[PDB]
Amino acid sequence: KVFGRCELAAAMKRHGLDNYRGYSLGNWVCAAKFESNFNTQATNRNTDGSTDYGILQINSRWWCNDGRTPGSRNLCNIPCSALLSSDITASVNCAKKIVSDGNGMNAWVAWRNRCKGTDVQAWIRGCRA
Ligand SMILES: [Pt+2]
Ligand SMILES: [Pt+2]
């Protein structure tokens, strides 16, 4: 599924991301835009043996188990295929775990590089809610 920005904002808001650990909703929508282009099926298969999965491009070395990545920690306790679902709940829950395990949104390179310190509210501006 490829989300619209406002639809994704509403789904993320239903799952408690607005102001989760001090990160406003627009930050999360912006991260998804630049990680995956809002595409729940996105994958990036890396040369290090790992793969990035789903709307938030969560990596298979630390966070989810794809069976094939050296050094697997599976800290979200989920198969990586769960992060390719059309509903975002597993990706949201794992994103919350990523932050809970010592990280800011700095854990997402696209957030640091394309959302950090910008007008992230542009991603929710004009959305119904
Ligand atoms: Pt889909
Ligand atoms: Pt939730």
Swiss-Prot record:
Disulfide bonds join C6-C127, C30-C115, C64-C80, C76-C94. It is found in: Secreted. It catalyses: Hydrolysis of (1->4)-beta-linkages between N-acetylmuramic acid and N-acetyl-D-glucosamine residues in a peptidoglycan and between N-acetyl-D-glucosamine residues in chitodextrins. The active site is at E35, D52. The keyword Chloroplast does not apply. Its main location: secreted. Monomer. This is Lysozyme C.
